[PDB]
């Protein structure tokens, strides 16, 4: 009779071949339809080839793997190389999908907004734009810095914006032989400023005492927004007011035995 | 007859048809969820789209590929791929994860607490708030550091508010021909302050004999919280004190012969 | 009777030897025609050999070992050696993959084009070509400099041409015994040029207090194109004119006590 | 009749629910068990929270996975799904396990002792306690130190108390034209303290001519002990009687040519 | 009657047993032939002793395992430890693999070409041979630097020969109450050299304020291999023209008050 | 009937219960003995509980694992767990595993003994014990040093007395108006002693042109052991006989044109 | 009757004690073997008990789970669990295999012999032997450096022996007021020792100009062994034959502008 074989045989080859058929259909519909919203998003098209091919070629790897396999074939070798493959892809990618999990991170987790003058990565400078894939900076200068956001969000940030109020400090070189009551006395009555917060109320102390000067810290507290005006004003009248009661700010000072 | 066969194959197909009606419910009801809870916690719309559309997308290409296996296809080649994604994804997560269970070891064994000045990754501040992604830190100009708690929870921390007892050291350099028992007895009547411990009683070395002066080191103890006052006191009190018996502080010393 | 189990082994060495004639055949033609086409790109001709042949090899031990397992040999640890080999292949090929991965996002978001002028990876340099594989600069020397694209795009990179206006800043010591708000007058009043914006209008400021002379910092917008025109301009006018009010520029002063 | 197959099925499905139903009882017994135990322990009710649940959600995916495989269901997508997840928390712990296998190899074999100063990973002090997880050390200042023991034990460790005896060096730049004879005379007679061992006997030789002083190296041996008492009373007692004999601590010597 | 089985297990054991045959004789004449070859091209013999050695041991556990499983044996356990070793010599292989793709990439897009002036990974000279495995330069010193190929082609490489024409620059210091115009017109008036391209014109602008001189800069276009002679050319008639028209270059200048 | 059918699985159950009771009592017997085995060896009994218990449970998950399966139970996913976490366990170890490679290559290899001064590592000192997993150094000073034999084995190490003879060079700065040839005669008839070998006789040059002293460099071979002897000797007496024929060993000199 | 299952069973269970019993004794006479070459090439006994130990305990764990899973043993649990150990095992392992690699290639592509003078992974000396596993220099002090193999072929090679003509260049610098034609023809005129080759006759050029003095710079060929012969001679010539024709090599000069 031998019938049953032979239509268990045909079976199996009658589904293989409508699966070939229905998957080769529908890879080129969907690599068609890939290209077509690749090109209505205006790309480059050295970027639109080698991913409609690269989509197509993949997929057609594995229907033909498929149905090999569902016909008689044996092909645990095809997809060892396969997986292989696969695997090499997928480390070959880590960077990038590294820094689209750090932008997730820094969207869900805010550490700095836009505005925000920030530090990190050995770059600094204000927010300009977060992505998803980077994050950019204008710089000091006004040039432009463009941070990934992996090694951004899994290192330290620095945020000078973040806090309604910033501590400035100070610091200048005296004499050796003035008297450092009168001096810090002489700094305290220089943060009179409408600008200076009273609330932690200033504080002038001497810090450590340098090879050729001894060296005043004045500690203020101000408003984010005003720390380099206050910086550059005590930059200026720092001098301008010590000089009047007879306190110098000196210079690199040696002594000398001369032997003749 | 052949009606065994028929039944056999029916059976089949209905079971697969049935998980596929099911499955698809069941994705469509848990994204629907997913996406009221994630609106419901006003996080931004860009951050919800890829998350919804994400967990849709991958629960629907599991479903379809066991669906497709269960019928009559081989998708041995497709179970590879779906592997070898999976591993791309899981490798592209190392570091958010890696926080995130720094974070719990922080939270289980702890170093530091809120308010503790500590130091650690090249940064140093008080901690203002601990999660379990990062940790925050207030530096001492009051700008706001956010360290990654794996780098952290693997790294070494300094806790400078943990004991409860502080050394305050010194360091001054005197001159060369002055006699130094008498320098540092003049250095140990200089921390008799109601807030230097007599516990392990003060003490005054000659430590190393440096090119222009010779280093005198102070060291007594003091509660953790006095520790500036102290040292800054020190700082003035010192040469105030010092050149009082006739020791001076020396410049950068020099010796010139002339040839001329 | 014997005869099912004989002709049950017949048609799977007979599907066997047809798969062996039918890969063997198809692996000749595809490696005949890769060999063809890399002919005629005009490579070199050691590029080709180890090329054809790797292929035909990978492909010949893939086919081989599907074909001695269909008959009915066990080939677990060929398969086993064969994912080995394949995973070593994939890992020793990160670094490629990586640069094409990364050249492939450089051409996704745009943070450079040709002809600006970045900063990154230790080089800097005007962009000559974007390809996907690396990016060549030409340095302000006229050198050539190749940059591969995967550590390019992971990691920080400084655009000098994307924004319209930049900042030239400026510096210059000035005496210790001169009046700043004078200085500063000066150094205003040779911004006058029609190359200086008005829009932020300029700023003059001390910066630090150094340690032989005062920092006075000149701060103006001019156009990106004129930033270096602005600057040596400065660098001449900057003496010129503040020397004509009696403000020097110092040398490293210092003060020397000498005992005989 | 069509009975066996349909007792066939029944038996299945029976087999696949009791084992739903016991394995969830299980589950829930466990974790409420978990939970009580981490209560009684007095942790953090944020760590209890995403304890009990993953660890029943991981148990409850498990289970459905195996039951759903157990009727009728091809559950290869989802086995490959979550041992792909598996795989990416298993990487994502790495640091902490190999702090806790530090910690093993620390207590296994004892590089160091609680009370020994030792030096390691950037830091020194006193170890003040071994855990499994980290260590901790009191600085020479009476701050805190943790460092992790994955690190520690994997890097080079300095024991500075392990040795019963230690050597004292010392060093001291003398003038150019002195003896250097009678100066290392002078240096061993400076070493009778009854502190310094006899037993390697003391040594004193002249190392490096440095570019203003010669420099002479005394060398002895004490106990571990009294190694920094016997150092500051070298640095002081070696000034003093050097100058006896007439033999200078030299500055920085300078030749200098004037042409006017 | 048990003649059914027997015949099972013998056609099973005959298959194994020819397979074994057959494989140990396909084994032990590849070998020959690879020693053979490697005979043939004069290697040393330490280097061809493990490799026929390996060689034949790997294909024999794997021929013996394969066999062993034919005939009854579970060999599971054999294949999970045959693919563990796999893995690692895998892993133990990686950088040389990547040696060789790095070569196959400098092979394929051309960086630099044999007779260029390169420099990379911290070394520079001219590339004398490019191989797969590494690339060979002779120093400035005609030292022989081998770098690999693997470092090489991920990292940057500046290449010196590449562009037909290269920018001089310049630099020398001069006084500081010189008159920079003029200075700038004698500098202009030294590259009249018939080397000095006039196609981008010749520019000659002042440069950073130095703190002992100011620092002018030429700035000059040539043809590649003209580079040094001009630059030496400068070198010298730099001073020997600016010294005509009376600037100098200065020494370290110093300015001290002397106190008595 | 329906016999056969619970014969068949009664004895499947039956098999499954032998197995675990026998697995059971194997593994309780095992941990005794290992329990009993550690606390023989007097380790810490913190370190015995999680080795005892960690020991116990691995098992036991192990062999649940198997008769759930060996039933019924469909057990995929657990064994997907299971690998996973043994993946995890395997990479928490790879350190301390490295190290025990290292220690085994250091004792197949010996690159050195004990008493053996050597140099890897960022320290140096005298090999006292080398053991299987780290190696022990005395420091110059005495203290204990731990390095571990993984990196130890991975990276150079300098042994100094690994050669019986060694090379001590010298160098001495002398006068720029000293007759060279006088002064390396004058260095040559200074290793007259007993000591510097004549068998590669000593040599006398003129090394580098310093900017205060033109450098004369002796080189002499000495036996390992006399090495430092021979220094400190022509650190005296380099000096001491020098300044017999008028060569001085100069200050750093400086040409001084002063402007008044 | 029952028979016909019976004896299918009693086969398995006679086929798995046969495999048992022979796989023992095969594993014992394996590790006596082994044991008896190690003791025969005299190895340290440390060495031999665990490496018998281990061969034997990892056969018989293989040999044992797979007879187990041979009766009727679910041992899927136990096969993850071997494969973890033998992945973790095989990460351990990587530098060592590193090692080997590279001293393979390292023997294959020469890129030094025995005698040359290398310098690599920071060290230098000359190459004393080479192995499969690390490298042995003799330094220039004759101390001995151990290399491994891996690190040092995945490196770059710097050989100083490898060309048979090698470029002595020089240094000197000289008075600002010299006429520097006069001063490079002296200079030509002092390389006419019959040693430095004519074939790429010798230059003389004006490098850099210094801060103190102008730096000149001689540039001739000599043969690879005749390199710091010439080098000495010239550090002796340059000054003696410069200064004969009134060109000095001056001090650091430096001009100061006395205020008193």
């Given at each position: 009779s031998w019938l049953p074989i032979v239509l268990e045989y045909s079976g199996k080859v009658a589904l293989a071949l409508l699966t070939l058929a229905i998957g080769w259909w529908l890879i080129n519909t969907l690599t068609g339809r890939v290209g077509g919203l690749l090109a209505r998003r205006s790309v480059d098209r050295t970027l639109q080839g080698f991913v409609g091919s690269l989509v197509?070629?993949?997929?057609?790897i594995l229907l033909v793997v498929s149905v090999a396999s569902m016909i008689g074939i044996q092909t645990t070798s095809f997809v060892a190389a396969i997986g292989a493959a696969?695997?090499?892809?997928?480390?070959?990618?880590?960077?990038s999908l590294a820094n689209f999990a750090g932008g997730?991170?820094?969207?869900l987790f805010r550490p700095f907004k836009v505005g925000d003058w920030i530090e990190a990565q050995g770059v600094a400078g204000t927010v300009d734009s977060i992505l998803i894939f980077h994050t950019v900076l204008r710089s000091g200068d006004n040039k432009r810095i463009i941070v990934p956001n992996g090694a951004l969000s899994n290192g330290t940030v620095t945020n000078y914006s973040a806090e309604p109020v910033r501590r400035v400090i100070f610091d200048v070189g005296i004499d050796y032989d003035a008297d450092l009551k009168n001096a810090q006395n002489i700094l305290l009555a220089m943060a009179d400023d409408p600008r200076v917060l009273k609330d932690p109320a200033p504080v002038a102390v001497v810090s450590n005492?340098?090879?050729s000067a001894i060296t005043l810290s004045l500690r203020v507290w101000v408003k984010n927004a005003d720390y380099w005006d206050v910086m550059f004003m005590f930059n200026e009248k720092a001098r301008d007011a010590?000089?009047?009661?007879?306190?110098?700010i000196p210079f690199p000072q040696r002594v000398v035995k001369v032997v003749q």
């Open positions: 197509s070629i993949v997929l057609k696969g695997l090499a892809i997928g480390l070959a990618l880590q960077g997730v991170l820094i969207l005492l340098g090879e010590l000089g009047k009661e007879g306190i110098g």
